[PDB]
Design an enzyme around this catalytic site. Sequence first.
Site, short mmCIF file in Angstrom:
data_model
loop_
_atom_site.label_atom_id
_atom_site.label_comp_id
_atom_site.label_asym_id
_atom_site.label_seq_id
_atom_site.Cartn_x
_atom_site.Cartn_y
_atom_site.Cartn_z
N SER A 80 6.81 -1.11 10.87
CA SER A 80 5.46 -0.82 10.45
C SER A 80 5.45 0.69 10.28
O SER A 80 6.17 1.42 10.99
CB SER A 80 4.45 -1.25 11.55
OG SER A 80 3.28 -0.42 11.47
N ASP A 137 8.61 9.24 -3.67
CA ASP A 137 9.55 8.60 -2.75
C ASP A 137 9.52 7.05 -2.85
O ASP A 137 10.58 6.39 -2.87
CB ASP A 137 9.28 9.01 -1.32
CG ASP A 137 10.33 8.43 -0.35
OD1 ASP A 137 11.49 8.92 -0.32
OD2 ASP A 137 10.00 7.47 0.39
N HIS A 186 8.87 0.93 3.52
CA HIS A 186 9.95 0.88 4.48
C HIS A 186 10.75 -0.41 4.26
O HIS A 186 10.46 -1.21 3.32
CB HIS A 186 9.39 0.99 5.94
CG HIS A 186 8.37 -0.04 6.29
ND1 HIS A 186 8.68 -1.38 6.39
CD2 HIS A 186 7.06 0.06 6.65
CE1 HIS A 186 7.60 -2.07 6.71
NE2 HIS A 186 6.60 -1.21 6.88
N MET A 192 0.82 -1.19 0.00
CA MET A 192 0.00 0.00 0.00
C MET A 192 0.86 1.24 0.00
O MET A 192 0.38 2.32 0.41
CB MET A 192 -0.91 -0.05 1.21
CG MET A 192 -1.86 -1.14 1.03
SD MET A 192 -3.24 -1.06 2.19
CE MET A 192 -2.35 -1.69 3.61
N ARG A 241 3.24 2.53 11.22
CA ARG A 241 2.63 3.08 12.44
C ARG A 241 3.62 3.45 13.55
O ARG A 241 3.28 4.26 14.43
CB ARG A 241 1.58 2.13 12.98
CG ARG A 241 0.54 1.77 11.98
CD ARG A 241 -0.58 1.02 12.64
NE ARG A 241 -1.70 0.78 11.74
CZ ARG A 241 -2.70 -0.06 12.00
NH1 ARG A 241 -2.72 -0.73 13.15
NH2 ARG A 241 -3.69 -0.22 11.12
N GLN A 259 12.62 4.54 -4.15
CA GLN A 259 13.04 3.33 -3.42
C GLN A 259 13.02 2.08 -4.32
O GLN A 259 13.97 1.29 -4.30
CB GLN A 259 12.20 3.10 -2.17
CG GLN A 259 12.61 4.01 -1.03
CD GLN A 259 11.81 3.72 0.19
OE1 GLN A 259 12.09 2.78 0.94
NE2 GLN A 259 10.80 4.55 0.43
O1 LIG Z 1 1.87 -2.28 2.20
C1 LIG Z 1 1.73 -3.36 2.82
O2 LIG Z 1 2.36 -3.50 3.88
C2 LIG Z 1 0.81 -4.35 2.39
C3 LIG Z 1 0.68 -5.57 3.05
C4 LIG Z 1 -0.28 -6.45 2.55
C5 LIG Z 1 -1.02 -6.20 1.47
N1 LIG Z 1 -1.97 -7.01 0.94
S1 LIG Z 1 -2.60 -6.22 -0.30
N2 LIG Z 1 -1.70 -4.88 -0.23
C6 LIG Z 1 -0.89 -5.02 0.84
C7 LIG Z 1 0.01 -4.13 1.28
#
Ligand SMILES: O=C(O)c1ccc2nsnc2c1
Lengths: 289, 275
Positions: free
Chosen positions: B183, B75, B43, B39, B185, B79
């Site tokens: 993460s 960005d 990182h 998504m 977060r 990467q």
């Molecule tokens: O960006 C992620 O950590 C991530 C992690 C799991 C995913 N399943 S569909 N898209 C995803 C994206």
Amino acid sequence: IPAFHPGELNVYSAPGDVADVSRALRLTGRRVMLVPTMGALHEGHLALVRAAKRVPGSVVVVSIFVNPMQFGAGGDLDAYPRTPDDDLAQLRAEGVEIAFTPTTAAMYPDGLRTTVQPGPLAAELEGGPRPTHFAGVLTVVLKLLQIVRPDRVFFGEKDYQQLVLIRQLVADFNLDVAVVGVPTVREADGLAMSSRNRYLDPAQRAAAVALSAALTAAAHAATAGAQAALDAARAVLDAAPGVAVDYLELRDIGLGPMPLNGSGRLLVAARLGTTRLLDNIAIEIGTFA
Amino acid sequence: AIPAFHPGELNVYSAPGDVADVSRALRLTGRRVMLVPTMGALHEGHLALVRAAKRVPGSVVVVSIFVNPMQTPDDDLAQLRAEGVEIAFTPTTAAMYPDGLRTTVQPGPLAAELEGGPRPTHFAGVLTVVLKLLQIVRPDRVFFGEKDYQQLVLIRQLVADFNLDVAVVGVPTVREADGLAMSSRNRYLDPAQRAAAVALSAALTAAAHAATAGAQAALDAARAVLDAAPGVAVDYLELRDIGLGPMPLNGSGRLLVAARLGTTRLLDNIAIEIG
Ligand SMILES: O=C(O)c1ccc2nsnc2c1
Ligand SMILES: O=C(O)c1ccc2nsnc2c1
């Protein structure tokens, strides 16, 4: 790859076997055509096989599988016609090279776990009192497409709402397959071919012509608009002894959240004794017909 | 005519039909297509998925970046460039859901448990977009991090249940120096919360070593470490078998935890070998 003898009927029951044969065929450039069926094959099925056959370089896979997940409890599953000896003879007569006949255990080793959830169209018409029916159908058709990976898949227009939901599945999950709808095959009086026609006694068989008569009447009446078309069909169904109408509806071609314009589909479902029959027809409204 | 693809450079495609065409063309030329769904906001944990994908001989690496409404661009792209990824797939919501939410995947009963507690529809959304990306890109292998363990298990169920012809590869969680699972977060944690957040990994690794003394010693060691941290509200701490069913008397399992620090929800999990 298990054995594949070209020019004859190769029967595979293991999904891995048909998947391996299919992939090998596609990699040598053959185009794999899938005709999903529940067996009890009749001329309406052979019309699907014939359409698949005329695609250049095709190899035809016909699946036969009475899918328990699209059946509701209450006797329907045990009652479905099973004639596998006849089915394979017909396929050999047609020059089909692959029949896929999986077991329930091979299709459903984890019972119902991940499944397909159809859109709201599946709750209407045939889905109204059978709210899990099309989840069953879409789940099995998804698995069959993934096992076989055909280029094109062939369905009869007789089960029009099912065809529409299958196109939805293919669009919604970006499946790389062309869905081919094939026109209904009818008996000489108009009766749509169906494996369940065998359950009409001679009087019910005589009466059942009212469905196709109603629809064809409505399609010609439709120069006079939708009300006329629907009232013509209803009058024919009303004149038929012992035909119990469950629905008669005129919809847009995609059956959907769009109002009827000039091109539509008229759908009927009716009970004769215990036997439920469906039929449908293209309708052009007013100027259009 | 197939869209343009330049080997050894980052080729970005936003249209699903375009990445589909390019993936199909490349596989026919002797490449093996590797998909890494993300998504964005990338990182080091995401780069470890990339690096695993890259080491497959003949690989071409497809990184999808799509914020799934159902569950900086520049960005992220830089990467991927620096990692030598040759394809990024950046679809719009409209391109992914052109008919809205219509046919979707319904997960099995695992999706109601654990993370599916506060978010009962979360996994339907993830499995739906995962199925779609698999069908658009048609990779040989698809790469997911072990940090979202329950997600990974549910993916493997999707793949088995729908007869999908892809290898699902789980890649070990990448961690900060003190063991905190990476993460996006983590950046919201203030200093006191960041210091306390190390109890999640510390509890799990303590349990993994306490497990020679059996399952109850492992769970009791993990709880003691979580009990030593301030401001760590534990939502669950469960030992399950490796497929997330009930933990068997001995053998392999997985210990999972989730907690809230302030407004931030953190998760972690670890392999456990009972006795
Ligand atoms: O960006 C992620 O950590 C991530 C992690 C799991 C995913 N399943 S569909 N898209 C995803 C994206
Ligand atoms: O046998 C059929 O007429 C038939 C019709 C539709 C089907 N969808 S999955 N299997 C199917 C079989």
